[PDB]
Design a binder for this molecule. Structure first.
Ligand SMILES: O=C(O)c1ccc(-c2nnc([C@@H]3O[C@H](CO)[C@@H](O)[C@H](O)[C@H]3O)[nH]2)cc1
Ligand SMILES: O=C(O)c1ccc(-c2nnc([C@@H]3O[C@H](CO)[C@@H](O)[C@H](O)[C@H]3O)[nH]2)cc1
Ligand SMILES: O=c1[nH]cnc2c1ncn2[C@@H]1O[C@@H](COP(=O)(O)O)[C@@H](O)[C@H]1O
Ligand SMILES: O=c1[nH]cnc2c1ncn2[C@@H]1O[C@@H](COP(=O)(O)O)[C@@H](O)[C@H]1O
Ligand SMILES: *Cc1c(COP(=O)(O)O)cnc(C)c1O
Ligand SMILES: *Cc1c(COP(=O)(O)O)cnc(C)c1O
Lengths: 810, 810
């Protein structure tokens, strides 16, 4: 039906129908009389998978023959979401599959909804890794994603009595048709033991062994016939493990727990032994695989010419001492040569400056679990500090600040300092964040080695985040400027010539309206709730965290409610305020924020004086598949973190691409988005980084704001007195106490400017033509935020490889 | 090449090659350049599996339409072995697959050796269940096997320093291509809780829930296009299970442990809670499935007309109170009606009279785990004892003996008594065993309800145990009498007309000689040991147990050694004595017996005076796939259990079919084998049951035999003094002490007759023509021991269904 979804040729459709029926019969062992919709989904997924495998084999064969430099992207998280539609988009099969299924009496959209998200990440960091894989394949890079195949991904969120409850995400229950187990490339990983010093070096002995079994998933590029690999490791006990008899078999679970569950924290370091085991597990298995592939092309001087290892935050930082262990202890390279190879091979991306997010492992843990790695870390530290002392003689405090070993009650290893010492490139993820790294937390390292420090502003894939989730928008764009923009997003600039075009204005608004109707209906069906689709859709979706300031949004919502109640017969622009996201299970304040949001909804949504002027909805179980539905429906994107706290953001970019305007602080990538679109086309408010710093020097006193702003005082009195919790009047006292006395994120300091800026949003929404013209100016300038741009910069400036848009033969 | 393996038509071969390459490419995601032999095995298995699925769907469809009476065979064990060859045999595909693989440059026999045994049983009981499934499919019965999908089957046995070591049997590591997961038919199973009595009956509440997920495996009949189902249940935790967060997810293993591992005991009741959970798990899931299928054909009067449930020993005995629970508590039938339905539905097969093998569960366990079932058991008992009291008034001791509840230190439920009370048929597994049941342990029950008690002599499938494992023998038989004997084994009687046929005599001996050469070579390759293939192959393979008397065999072997050493220059018929089998991990005496056998080997095999006259080999890791290799190579089958202890045996039958002569006691099915072949064609020795009873009344005194038999005294002195363990002279004192003072199985009492009978074996082996003529008389009369005969008797005399040799259409 729509051009960007490709051709539905008679031959293709016939062949797809044949293969669908073949899989239903032979693969699934069903006939049409007892097949369920889930069987039909699987028969389609196997049909589409067959089209990948030829390209997958040929791509991997091509890399063996050409022997290009290989890029290894190491991450503890790959937030992939669903695969079926993305595969169809990238193979140009969507219209053919639609037609084929339609002729079989089936609705393909319904089958798509059956697939489970691969929820192997927490939020932005995990999703960035997924976008990056898509871009590396699209740009023809010989790239491999390496991670852990968690049995349970990010928990499913249920809301019960307004509180978050967690349920296990048993995503593999019905099988995963996309992966291929490769038990033949199973590798041993060692833990515990002790170090023996012999005549010819150190030996790590008496270890416990866990096997790492790989599962491979194909990663198709956009219409270029390249299919790369994501290799995820699963933990298995050896067969002699603990080998009365019955108990020894049941105790195999202790080893296999390593890959059981994703730690559900976003921007918070928990410090548990199981997490450290996960980190080493992924690193040790991956590095053996890398070395095997290198040897099957003595001479490790060429290793950095054939291998790049990108560390996604510090989570895989043990790659640095593990590489040194292998080169020194097993290959018998001298230390200095090994270190040169290591530094030239590794590069580190930092994703946060929040102190509670930084990994600082207790020395006693490393000593017990990884005794050889601790020795190597100490030697790295001594040699590194010797360089510092030579460059800054007498500066004893600098030595203490830069040490990999932190002194204190418990000695800890600072993993970020290890990553900087052992990498040839260190980057932040947006311009403001990379500057903050050089001025504050890594200032000392920047002064020693300025050449290491770079910026690589984040991006998102326009395949998933435009073509897949918003085909109506993709199509009206394609009608004007063709299809090349899908792999060259800078071509969206051509849309600025259609800012005064009456037909284009109408089409952009029509597509938004359709997306809003479709989402309003989705809400009714799956969650028994009614919304006005003519209201402004005001959306804040992201993990729940104090720094992201869902609480600031809550204060605005209550302000609007109180204004309506004060002057009920005055016109206000109707809004549907939607907030969604998961709280980490142990993060009490985040769980209280969720409860506050639902409690505000319980009052606002049932007040007959409000009517359909204001609705507050908590969107349950926010995840990649839900993002694909809500983002195309949004009018206003809330990006309201305290300046200096959101390293980049990527949700922000998804909203910009899909025709929402942004209300935001000058934080993370918001700064660059505003620069690209023009500040006049963005709703900027609040303290800049420098203003936050000035307040911190003086002392933040929240009481001053309470005393000066009557509207704010009223809200705090309502919270304290039980207005939003009549049966439990003190339910929110922890929230009030934090806001008044211990608010690290200065919610009150941005309240007045936020409310005023929100009034400007409402004023523009009253003039649909001008709202839509501003939207066009945003979409048109979103090209910089393609992850294709991001990856091309990594490739050229860090990895030393050239991207290619050349197609492999089919 | 050979006729019984079917046709290799050009069209068939071409199609198999095409599909093999299709699976290698699309299913396995390999090309020929990186494929391993394991990949080739999987590509073949998927190719053969495709030929099953059409017949499988059609068979199950046919049962839905015709609605025949369904037979449910409940077992905790299904000892299946490998599937690939058996599937080819039953579909007549073996020669075509051989030719197809040969044209691809591959050796099919090598690929077959890659497949793991499905080792989901311990020995005879589990293997009987597997033979039965094959016969039920071959006889066109609408039959379902129901069990547990253990993650770890019977342990792999390694011998280290002559001792058994156990290793986990991780049989699913590389995947199982034969099964199909059916997560859509997942069912809840309840544990713990308590009983509430309401106005309208008992309710079982506050239970813990475990999910039972079914996996289905096809069971093809012999060339009749029938494919039945074996449904095995796997334990899964619900997603809200224990739902800090991380620990709750890791604790899901506690529920999933139910299906983790097979208890490795043969003829020994251990009494562990986990085993009871396994028993209930299989019963509760299976009964829900049965009832669902019955309702999808109010009125449970027709239930026994549409359903038969066969209990494989007492392991699934909880089916009786579970059926009552469902009918009374959930369907609201009155007790008497429910009991009538239950009794008419259930039948019980007993497999042992050894007292330590009988299940007697402590009441406190049932009270905690299954409180409603315990109440139902007590009510069954009271009503049953009321009938006993009315039939035998005043006989208070009979009431105590027959009670389902045993008094004592700990009260126990006798599960055999429950099975008799709640079944319309009770059978033993060989004539002598069924008679023993009526005279001894179930005498009281027989007097109350004589009509319940039957015999069904065991059997083996001639598909696996002749055609598959011994194609050379199958072929030379087929050349004379055609192929119909493979599904009608009584036709082997026609071979008696070829007992004086010189060509047939020569061919029978030639096939044995070929099998011996092939096995001698297998031993060299896989286990670095050399044997004389002209020696008599004297084989005892079965689980290690005192009752099976591997020790009696050991005494004969030492006797032969001592005779050689006494008169080294006298001719003796050369022998290779092979003993193999697993010991249960906690059965200390069984483990000592293994060590004795290897220690005898260490002395005998290295004595230069013995030469190649005598070799003693312990066959490591005895299992179904090893049975298929060693049994066709055997000359002498050792079946030497103390009279009254081996309920039937089935190894005995496998040897008879494959051209070995038998040395044995009049125990189990040996009695019927000797009756069929003629006692003159069997090497019978030792005490009969009545002689054992006479010795028990007088008192067995082993010292008397030691005092009277100099050859026996010498052996005991050798064991005691360290002749077979020079570095640890007292290593075998537990064995000596048991034989001299606490031998329940009267080894010494049968020693003299055993040695004399063995001398008669040697004398016959010296005359190859007469040995082979006796062999022909055994093979010719083995027809009774087809499991097809056994199943036809169950079908007619217990289940009330008619077997059919009619083919479904292809
Ligand atoms: O489990 C942990 O220990 C953990 C998880 C995520 C993070 C994390 N740190 N930063 C992020 C997000 O990364 C994305 C992608 O760069 C940025 O857009 C966000 O600004 C940042 O918060 N996530 C830190 C620690
Ligand atoms: O795990 C247990 O608790 C268990 C296992 C097997 C047995 C068992 N009882 N009898 C058998 C064997 O059954 C076969 C098949 O009928 C007979 O041929 C053997 O004689 C018998 O020992 N096995 C008892 C208990
Ligand atoms: O000996 C070979 N001949 C041809 N191709 C090979 C050989 N070894 C590896 N390859 C290719 O590389 C393999 C995948 O690379 P790996 O990820 O290093 O195992 C296969 O996909 C092959 O296409
Ligand atoms: O509604 C129906 N129409 C046709 N066949 C059915 C229907 N329901 C069940 N069946 C058959 O029975 C099913 C298997 O039986 P089950 O083991 O009871 O699920 C399928 O194999 C079908 O062939
Ligand atoms: C993009 C995305 C995020 C990151 O959003 P931010 O607003 O940048 O934190 C988190 N979760 C999901 C499911 C996403 O798709
Ligand atoms: C047949 C068989 C048995 C039973 O043999 P018995 O000699 O009757 O105990 C045990 N194990 C395996 C592997 C078998 O094939």
């Amino acid at each position: 039906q729509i051009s960007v979804r490709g051709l539905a040729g008679v031959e293709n459709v016939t062949e797809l129908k044949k293969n669908f029926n073949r899989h239903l019969h032979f693969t699934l062992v069903k006939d049409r009389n007892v097949a369920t919709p889930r069987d039909y989904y699987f028969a389609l997924a196997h049909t589409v998978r067959d089209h990948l495998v030829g390209r997958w084999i040929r791509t991997q064969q091509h890399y063996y023959e050409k022997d290009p430099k290989r890029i290894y992207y190491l991450s503890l998280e790959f937030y992939m979401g669903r695969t079926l539609q993305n595969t169809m988009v990238n193979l140009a099969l969507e219209n053919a599959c639609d037609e084929a299924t339609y002729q079989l009496g089936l609705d393909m959209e319904e089958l798509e909804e059956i697939e489970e998200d691969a929820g192997l990440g927490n939020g932005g960091l995990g999703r960035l890794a997924a976008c990056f894989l898509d871009s590396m394949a699209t740009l023809g890079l010989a790239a491999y994603g390496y991670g852990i195949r968690y049995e349970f991904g990010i928990f499913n969120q249920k809301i019960c009595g307004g509180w978050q409850m967690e349920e296990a995400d048993d995503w593999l229950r019905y099988g995963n048709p996309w992966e291929k187990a490769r038990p033949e490339f199973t590798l041993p990983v060692h833990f515990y033991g002790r170090v023996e010093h012999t005549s010819q070096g150190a030996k790590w002995v008496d270890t416990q062994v866990v096997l790492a079994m790989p599962y491979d998933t194909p990663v198709p590029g956009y219409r270029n016939n390249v299919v790369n690999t994501m290799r995820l490791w699963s933990a298995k006990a050896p067969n002699d493990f603990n080998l009365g008899y019955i108990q020894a078999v049941l105790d195999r679970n202790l080893a296999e727990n390593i890959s059981r569950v994703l730690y559900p924290n976003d921007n918070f370091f928990e410090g548990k032994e199981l997490r450290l085991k996960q980190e080493y597990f992924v690193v040790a298995a991956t590095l053996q695989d890398i070395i095997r592939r290198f040897k099957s092309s003595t001479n490790f001087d060429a290793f950095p010419d054939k291998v790049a290892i990108q560390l996604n935050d510090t989570h895989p930082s043990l790659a640095i001492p593990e590489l040194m262990r292998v080169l020194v202890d097993l290959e018998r390279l001298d230390w200095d040569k090994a270190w040169e190879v290591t530094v030239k091979t590794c590069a580190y991306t930092n994703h946060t400056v929040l102190p509670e997010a930084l990994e600082r492992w207790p020395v006693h843990l490393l000593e017990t679990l990884l005794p050889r790695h601790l020795q190597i870390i100490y030697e790295i530290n001594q040699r590194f500090l010797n360089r510092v002392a030579a460059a800054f003689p007498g500066d004893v405090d600098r030595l203490r600040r830069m040490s990999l070993v932190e002194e204190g009650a418990v000695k800890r290893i600072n993993m970020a300092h290890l990553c900087i010492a052992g990498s040839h490139a260190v980057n932040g993820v947006a311009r403001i964040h990379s500057e903050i790294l050089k001025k504050t937390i890594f200032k000392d390292f920047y002064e020693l080695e300025p050449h290491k420090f770079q910026n690589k502003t984040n991006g998102i894939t326009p395949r998933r985040w435009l073509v897949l989730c918003n085909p109506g928008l993709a199509e009206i764009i394609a009608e004007r400027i063709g299809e090349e923009y899908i792999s060259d997003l800078d071509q969206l600039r051509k849309l600025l010539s259609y800012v005064d075009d009456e037909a284009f204005i109408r089409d952009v608004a029509k597509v938004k309206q359709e997306n809003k109707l479709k989402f309003a209906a989705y809400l009714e069906r799956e969650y028994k709730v009614h919304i006005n689709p003519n209201s402004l859709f005001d959306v804040q979706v992201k993990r729940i965290h104090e720094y992201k300031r869902q609480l600031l949004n809550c204060l605005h919502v209550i302000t609007l409610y109180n204004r309506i109640k004060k002057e009920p017969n005055k016109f206000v622009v109707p809004r549907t305020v939607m907030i969604g996201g998961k709280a980490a299970p142990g993060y009490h304040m985040a769980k209280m924020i969720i409860k506050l949001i639902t409690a505000i909804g319980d009052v606002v949504n049932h007040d007959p004086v409000v009517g359909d002027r204001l609705r507050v909805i908590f969107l349950e179980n926010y995840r990649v598949s839900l993002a694909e539905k809500v983002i195309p429906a949004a009018d206003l994107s809330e990006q309201i973190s305290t300046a200096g706290t959101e390293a980049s953001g990527t949700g922000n970019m998804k909203f910009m691409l899909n025709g929402a305007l942004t209300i935001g602080t000058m934080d993370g990538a918001n700064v660059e988005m505003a620069e690209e679109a023009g500040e006049e086309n963005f709703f900027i408010f609040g303290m800049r980084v420098e203003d936050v710093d000035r307040l911190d020097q003086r002392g933040y006193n929240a009481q001053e704001y309470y005393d000066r702003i009557p509207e704010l005082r009223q809200i705090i009195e309502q919270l304290s007195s039980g207005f939003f919790s009549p049966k439990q009047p003190d339910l929110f006292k922890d929230i009030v106490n934090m806001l008044m006395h211990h608010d690290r994120f200065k919610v009150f300091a941005d309240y007045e400017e936020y409310v005023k800026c929100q009034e400007r949003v409402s004023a523009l929404y009253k003039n649909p033509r001008e709202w839509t013209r501003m939207v066009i100016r945003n979409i048109a300038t979103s090209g910089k935020f393609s992850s294709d741009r991001t990856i091309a910069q990594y490739a050229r400036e860090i990895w030393g490889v050239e991207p290619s848009r050349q197609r492999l033969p089919a």
